[PDB]
Design an enzyme around this catalytic site. Structure first.
Site, PDB file in Angstrom:
ATOM      1  N   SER A 131       0.851  -1.173   0.000  1.00 43.59           N
ATOM      2  CA  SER A 131       0.000   0.000   0.000  1.00 43.59           C
ATOM      3  C   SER A 131       0.888   1.224   0.000  1.00 43.59           C
ATOM      4  O   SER A 131       1.739   1.365  -0.874  1.00 43.59           O
ATOM      5  CB  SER A 131      -0.959  -0.013   1.191  1.00 43.59           C
ATOM      6  N   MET A 132       0.743   2.091   0.996  1.00 41.52           N
ATOM      7  CA  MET A 132       1.631   3.239   1.047  1.00 41.52           C
ATOM      8  C   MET A 132       3.038   2.810   1.393  1.00 41.52           C
ATOM      9  O   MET A 132       3.997   3.512   1.048  1.00 41.52           O
ATOM     10  CB  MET A 132       1.099   4.228   2.061  1.00 41.52           C
ATOM     11  N   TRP A 155       0.583   2.142  -3.224  1.00 38.53           N
ATOM     12  CA  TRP A 155      -0.130   3.397  -3.327  1.00 38.53           C
ATOM     13  C   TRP A 155       0.908   4.497  -3.256  1.00 38.53           C
ATOM     14  O   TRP A 155       1.768   4.485  -2.371  1.00 38.53           O
ATOM     15  CB  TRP A 155      -1.142   3.541  -2.190  1.00 38.53           C
ATOM     16  N   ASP A 177      -8.293  -3.990  -6.739  1.00 43.32           N
ATOM     17  CA  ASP A 177      -7.939  -2.977  -5.766  1.00 43.32           C
ATOM     18  C   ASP A 177      -8.714  -1.700  -6.014  1.00 43.32           C
ATOM     19  O   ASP A 177      -8.607  -1.091  -7.088  1.00 43.32           O
ATOM     20  CB  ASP A 177      -6.441  -2.709  -5.858  1.00 43.32           C
ATOM     21  N   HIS A 209      -7.158  -4.927  -2.304  1.00 42.15           N
ATOM     22  CA  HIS A 209      -5.962  -4.225  -1.878  1.00 42.15           C
ATOM     23  C   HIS A 209      -5.062  -5.081  -1.004  1.00 42.15           C
ATOM     24  O   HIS A 209      -3.877  -4.763  -0.835  1.00 42.15           O
ATOM     25  CB  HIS A 209      -6.375  -2.972  -1.125  1.00 42.15           C
TER      26      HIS A 209
END
Ligand SMILES: [Ca+2]
Ligand SMILES: [Ca+2]
Length: 266
Positions: A131-132, A155, A177, A209
């Site tokens: 993700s991040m 992300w 996602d 995700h």
């Protein structure tokens, strides 16, 4: 060179764990500056091995990336999974978190008293990041520090920072996602990386995700491809090339899209 373990097979890679028993060392958030986590390290091994930081990066995570710890460490890696709810958040902070986590492992590796003292080859660092944290992983990949990167459903806000990634980067994209939609994140991030870079884009069919986090419907793909990625790039273990370069990946039900720059290590 850095090869460890038997000649790999798919079943070897897709087995619920690798050959090595894995011991763990809990890292409190009060040390290391990366939110705490768990170092996974194999027993029975000799010599040094690559170290991998596995970092989450979804603040409202219902679950995390811990599967990667035992899974990857059991194939001959020191693998630290970073805890969630760390105060870190956005990809730039995740890059800092990764760097702090890498520092911590190297620091502990350099300690005479760490249970995995001397186990890490500091030259062979991988980062798996969700993700991040996947944005953070790509950012650290761009910083030049690491030798393999596996962003999981990454992300980030821009792919431009990724335009010169030379780190071997396998992006696990999660087809369905909606948090980091592939078309706005994993795909353009992957495409930002030069085609001269050893890279792969594995979009996992119908993946939410969370699809790259492991302990899920995608264990086979994540283990087979992700462990091979780390073996091939962190260990320069060409025996794992066969799982990355050769297979018609999209023929796999679980892989909705594959892109890559095979051959690698040219
Ligand atoms: Ca689908
Ligand atoms: Ca190539």
């Amino acid at each position: 060179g850095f090869q460890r373990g038997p000649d790999p097979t798919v079943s070897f890679l897709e087995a619920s764990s690798g050959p090595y028993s894995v011991r763990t060392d809990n890292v409190s958030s009060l040390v290391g500056g990366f939110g705490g986590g768990t170092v996974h390290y194999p027993t029975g091994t000799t010599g040094t091995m690559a170290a991998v930081v596995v970092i989450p990066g979804f603040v409202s995570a219902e679950s995390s990336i811990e599967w990667w710890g035992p899974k990857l460490a059991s194939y001959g890696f020191v693998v630290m999974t970073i805890d969630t709810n760390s105060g870190f958040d956005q990809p730039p902070s995740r890059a800092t978190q990764i760097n702090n986590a890498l520092d911590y492992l190297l620091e502990e590796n350099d300690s005479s008293s760490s249970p995995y003292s001397g186990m890490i080859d500091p030259n062979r660092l991988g980062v798996i990041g969700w993700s991040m944290g996947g944005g953070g992983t790509l950012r650290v990949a761009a910083e030049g520090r690491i030798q393999a990167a596996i962003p999981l459903a990454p992300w980030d806000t821009s792919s431009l920072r990724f335009r010169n990634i030379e780190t071997p980067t396998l992006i696990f994209a999660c087809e369905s996602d909606v948090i980091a939609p592939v078309g706005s994140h994993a795909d353009p991030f992957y495409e930002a990386i030069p085609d001269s870079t050893d890279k792969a884009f594995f979009e996992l069919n119908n993946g939410s995700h969370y699809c790259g986090n492991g302990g899920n419907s995608y264990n086979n793909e994540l283990g087979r491809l992700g462990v091979s990625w780390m073996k091939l790039h962190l260990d320069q273990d060409q025996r794992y090339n066969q799982f990355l370069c050769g297979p018609d990946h999209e023929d796999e039900y679980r892989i909705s899209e594959y892109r890559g720059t095979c051959p690698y290590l040219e």
